[PDB]
């Protein structure tokens, strides 16, 4: 499994994050029905839920740093080969 995890604005974040957390916690929702739910829930979005869009994104970026950094071609030698 090498599917990458990039930071994005609220809409995508809630789509990916909710799909992840809900699919694991309530297994039988994990497909198009989730997609239908989230779209509907988005239209009825309450401002209190606005903030976790951004916070969930912060965790997604944390998932990104859990992977190897952008460490590039060593100058001559690298003590982390």
UniProtKB/Swiss-Prot annotation:
The modification N6-methyllysine is found at residues 5, 80. Residues 4-72 bind DNA. Changing residue 5 to R: Loss of interaction with L3MBTL3. Loss of ubiquitination by the CRL4-DCAF5 E3 ubiquitin ligase complex. Loss of interaction with PHF20L1. Keywords: Activator, Cytoplasm, Developmental protein, Disease variant, DNA-binding, Isopeptide bond, Methylation, Microphthalmia, Nucleus, Phosphoprotein, Transcription, Transcription regulation, Ubl conjugation. Sumoylation inhibits binding on DNA and negatively regulates the FGF4 transactivation. It is found in: Nucleus speckle; Cytoplasm; Nucleus. GO terms for molecular function: DNA binding; DNA-binding transcription activator activity, RNA polymerase II-specific; DNA-binding transcription factor activity; DNA-binding transcription factor activity, RNA polymerase II-specific; miRNA binding; RNA polymerase II cis-regulatory region sequence-specific DNA binding; sequence-specific DNA binding; transcription cis-regulatory region binding. One of its GO terms (biological process) is eye development. Its main location: nucleus. It comes from the Eukaryota. POU5F1/OCT4, SOX2, MYC/c-Myc and KLF4 are the four Yamanaka factors. When combined, these factors are sufficient to reprogram differentiated cells to an embryonic-like state designated iPS (induced pluripotent stem) cells. iPS cells exhibit the morphology and growth properties of ES cells and express ES cell marker genes. Changing residue 80 to R: Loss of interaction with PHF20L1. The 9aaTAD motif is a transactivation domain present in a large number of yeast and animal transcription factors. Transcription factor that forms a trimeric complex with OCT4 on DNA and controls the expression of a number of genes involved in embryonic development such as YES1, FGF4, UTF1 and ZFP206. Binds to the proximal enhancer region of NANOG. Critical for early embryogenesis and for embryonic stem cell pluripotency. Downstream SRRT target that mediates the promotion of neural stem cell self-renewal. Keeps neural cells undifferentiated by counteracting the activity of proneural proteins and suppresses neuronal differentiation. May function as a switch in neuronal development. This is Transcription factor SOX-2. It comes from Homo sapiens. The gene is SOX2.
């Amino acid at each position: 499994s090498d599917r990458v995890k990039r930071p994005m604005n609220a809409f995508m974040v809630w789509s990916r994050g909710q799909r992840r957390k809900m699919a694991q916690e309530n297994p039988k929702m994990h497909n198009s029905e989730i997609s239908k739910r989230l779209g509907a829930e988005w239209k009825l979005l309450s401002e209190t839920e606005k903030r976790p869009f951004i916070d969930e994104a912060k965790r997604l970026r944390a998932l990104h740093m859990k992977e190897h950094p952008d460490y590039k071609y060593r100058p001559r030698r690298k003590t982390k080969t």
